[PDB]
């Protein structure tokens, strides 16, 4: 409750120091041994939503994955094993673009180069404006699948990067899948972006450990 | 000449009002709402009955009694809390 | 029950919508009257 | 006569805002002008000429929940309206370059004067004037 907010010399050296290599030991063993089956059982049950996710994607609704736990592996299985093969073998091999947001070295201009090559037949926003006018006359057929891990990533949180991704969902021939971890993530989007994103929300909390994202920030600083 | 008598028909009406007032004063700087404050409701009901020269404390007399007593506790509160108890006791 | 809870939490359309009477409740209503019907 | 009685140098319901939007702005002005000392004294059941001070996002949500007409909670719409006000520039942040909302060091302040908020509360029937 809100009333719980208004109603509110030790040092870490007093704790036993643990080396970086020792830290990875305990984490790896327990991430596999502890809560192994129930999380796998939940994952297998959650696979039953693939037809609904696949149906929603075709209608033009972006899918946002949120909840406690890592979501990198879940997005990998959905797009590669279920989404991409089914579209090709039902519309008649669809390329899938994977963007990592947990890496702070990501650059938006480098990402846009792939988009131009994969979709545009041979000032980023001006090029995007040309694409919208092009795909209006194009048939409503899914051509490229876009997955954006960590849409709250440190290099992705920035307003300029957010604007670039938001304009892409206007074109119906692109499929967008995104995941977030920050609690105040919806604050990053106003009406102008939420309308463009056209999200359909799913709470996919799985308590999956974030080993991959933990690599880019050192625990020894703590 | 007039000494109105009582019948325990509206016991639920008064008792729950007494409990409600006590609950809202458990953590708010306000009147010392105690047993002596409940007695005012009954005695002030007697006055209303004794205004009609009736010998019986009717349901209506307690209705005037409860409204006067409860409103006093609501009015003597801070602004930020007064508007909330305004609606919490709308039954009375 | 657990599957209904997880389906409701996940927002899946597989979970039934409670606008009609449930199958168990209507079955009980039918049977309690059929047993006294003949 | 009416030409001279007004300068008419002005360029011309002044701000179309949702119900969630109106309470969001009302709560913020309290944060920007009331000391943190008085948060518990007034709202818990236990300067008009100065420039506004900064405040944290947690202070805004707590006060917004405290005065909203049982709890309101913070769904996507509440944050959706809050971000729009920043886009509408009725609330300012402590940065100018490479805006990142989720960075913890950024603070918030009110960009709306007293006179506008006066009329907002009237359509809300919230008596702000008694809190000072």
UniProtKB/Swiss-Prot annotation, chain A:
The cellular location(s) given in this protein's UniProt record come to: Nucleus
**Coiled-coil region(s):** none
| Assembly description | Component of the origin recognition complex (ORC) composed of at least ORC1, ORC2, ORC3, ORC4, ORC5 and ORC6. Interacts with MCM10 and TAH11.
Role summary: Component of the origin recognition complex (ORC) that binds origins of replication. It has a role in both chromosomal replication and mating type transcriptional silencing. Binds to the ARS consensus sequence (ACS) of origins of replication.
Q: What else is known?
A: Present with 1700 molecules/cell in log phase SD medium.
According to its UniProt record, which protein family does this protein belong to? Answer: Belongs to the ORC2 family.
The protein's name is: Origin recognition complex subunit 2
Q: Which organism is it from?
A: Saccharomyces cerevisiae (strain ATCC 204508 / S288c)
**Name of encoding gene:** ORC2
From Swiss-Prot, chain B:
Indicate where this protein resides in the cell: Nucleus
Instruction: Give the highest taxon in the source lineage.
Output: Eukaryota
User: What is the residue range of the signal peptide feature?
Assistant: none
What does it do?
A: Acts as a component of the MCM2-7 complex (MCM complex) which is the putative replicative helicase essential for 'once per cell cycle' DNA replication initiation and elongation in eukaryotic cells. The active ATPase sites in the MCM2-7 ring are formed through the interaction surfaces of two neighboring subunits such that a critical structure of a conserved arginine finger motif is provided in trans relative to the ATP-binding site of the Walker A box of the adjacent subunit.
Of which family is this protein a member?
Belongs to the MCM family.
Q: How does it assemble?
A: Component of the MCM2-7 complex. The complex forms a toroidal hexameric ring with the proposed subunit order MCM2-MCM6-MCM4-MCM7-MCM3-MCM5; loaded onto DNA, forms a head-head double hexamer.
Q: What else is known?
A: Present with 1690 molecules/cell in log phase SD medium. Early fractionation of eukaryotic MCM proteins yielded a variety of dimeric, trimeric and tetrameric complexes with unclear biological significance. Specifically a MCM467 subcomplex is shown to have in vitro helicase activity which is inhibited by the MCM2 subunit. The MCM2-7 hexamer is the proposed physiological active complex.
Question: What protein does this entry describe?
Answer: DNA replication licensing factor MCM2
Species this chain originates from = Saccharomyces cerevisiae (strain ATCC 204508 / S288c) (Baker's yeast)
Curated annotation (Swiss-Prot), chain C:
Localization of this protein = Nucleus
* Record's signal peptide: none
Highest taxon above the source species: Eukaryota
Q: Quote the subunit structure annotation.
A: Component of the origin recognition complex (ORC) composed of at least ORC1, ORC2, ORC3, ORC4, ORC5 and ORC6. Interacts with ORC3, ORC5 and TAH11.
Remaining remarks: Present with 2970 molecules/cell in log phase SD medium.
Q: What is the stated purpose of this protein?
A: Component of the origin recognition complex (ORC) that binds origins of replication. It has a role in both chromosomal replication and mating type transcriptional silencing. Binds to the ARS consensus sequence (ACS) of origins of replication.
Similarity comment: family membership: Belongs to the ORC6 family.
What is the designated name of this protein? Origin recognition complex subunit 6
**Record organism:** Saccharomyces cerevisiae (strain ATCC 204508 / S288c)
Part of the full-length chain shown? 393 to 430 of 435
Swiss-Prot record, chain D:
- Which superkingdom, per the lineage? Eukaryota
What is its subcellular localisation? Nucleus
Q: List the disulfide bonds.
A: none
Q: Which proteins does it associate with, and in what oligomeric form?
A: Component of the origin recognition complex (ORC) composed of at least ORC1, ORC2, ORC3, ORC4, ORC5 and ORC6. Interacts with ORC6. Component of a cullin-RING ligase (CRL)-like complex composed of at least the cullin RTT101, a linker protein MMS1, and the potential substrate receptor ORC5. Interacts with RTT101 and MMS1.
Role this protein plays: Component of the origin recognition complex (ORC) that binds origins of replication. It has a role in both chromosomal replication and mating type transcriptional silencing. Binds to the ARS consensus sequence (ACS) of origins of replication. This subunit is a candidate for the mediation of ATP-dependent binding of ORC to origins. May also be a substrate targeting component of a cullin-RING-based E3 ubiquitin-protein ligase complex RTT101(MMS1-ORC5).
Query: Anything else the record notes?
Result: Present with 768 molecules/cell in log phase SD medium.
Family label: Belongs to the ORC5 family.
* Protein name (record): Origin recognition complex subunit 5
Organism of provenance:
Saccharomyces cerevisiae (strain ATCC 204508 / S288c) (Baker's yeast)
């Amino acid at each position: 409750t809100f009333e719980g907010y208004f109603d509110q010399r030790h040092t870490m050296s007093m704790a036993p120091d643990v080396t970086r290599e020792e830290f990875s030991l305990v984490s790896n063993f327990f991430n596999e041994n502890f809560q192994k089956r129930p999380r796998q059982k939940l994952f297998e049950i959650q696979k039953k939503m693939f037809p609904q996710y696949w149906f929603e994607l075709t209608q033009g609704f972006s899918l946002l994955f949120y909840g406690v736990g890592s979501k990198r592996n879940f997005l990998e299985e959905f797009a590669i094993d279920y989404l991409s093969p089914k579209i090709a073998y039902s519309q008649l091999s669809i390329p899938c673009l994977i963007l990592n947001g947990y890496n702070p070295s990501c650059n938006y201009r480098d990402v846009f180069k792939e988009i131009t090559d994969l979709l545009v037949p041979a000032h980023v926003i001006l090029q995007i404006q040309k694409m919208i006018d092009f795909y209006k006359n194009q048939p409503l057929d899914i051509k490229l699948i876009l997955v954006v891990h960590n849409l709250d990533g440190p290099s992705i949180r920035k307003n300029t990067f957010q604007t670039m991704l938001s304009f892409l969902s206007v074109i119906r021939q692109i499929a967008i899948v995104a995941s977030t971890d920050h609690i105040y993530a919806p604050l990053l989007w106003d009406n102008m972006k939420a309308q463009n994103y056209n999200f359909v929300f799913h709470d996919i909390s799985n308590f999956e450990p974030s080993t991959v994202e933990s690599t880019f920030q050192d625990v020894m600083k703590m | 000449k007039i000494y109105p008598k009582l019948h325990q028909m509206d016991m639920d009406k008064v008792s729950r009002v007494y409990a409600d007032l006590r609950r809202e004063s458990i953590s708010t700087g306000s009147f010392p709402i105690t047993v002596r404050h409940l007695e005012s409701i009954l005695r002030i009901a007697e006055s209303f009955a004794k205004m009609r020269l009736s010998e019986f404390v009717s349901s209506y007399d307690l209705d005037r009694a409860i409204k006067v007593v409860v409103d006093s506790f609501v009015d003597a509160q801070k602004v930020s809390v007064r508007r909330q108890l305004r609606r919490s006791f709308a039954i009375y | 029950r657990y599957d209904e809870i997880i389906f409701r939490k996940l927002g899946s359309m597989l979970q039934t919508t409670n606008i009609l009477v449930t199958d168990d409740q209507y079955n009980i209503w039918k049977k309690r009257i059929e047993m006294d019907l003949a | 006569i009416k030409l001279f009685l007004s300068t008419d140098d002005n360029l011309s319901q002044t701000y179309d805002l949702s119900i969630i939007s109106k309470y969001l702005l009302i709560a913020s002005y309290i944060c920007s002008y009331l000391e943190p000392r008085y948060d518990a004294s007034i709202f818990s059941r236990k300067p008009r000429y100065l420039q506004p001070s900064l405040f944290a996002i947690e202070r805004l949500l707590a006060i917004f929940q405290a005065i909203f007409p049982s709890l309101m909670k913070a769904n996507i719409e509440v944050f959706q309206n809050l971000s729009e006000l920043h886009t509408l520039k009725l609330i300012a942040t402590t940065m100018n370059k490479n805006i990142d909302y989720l960075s913890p060091k950024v603070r918030w302040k009110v960009n709306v004067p007293w006179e506008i908020i006066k009329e907002i509360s009237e359509s809300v029937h919230f008596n702000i004037s008694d809190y000072f």
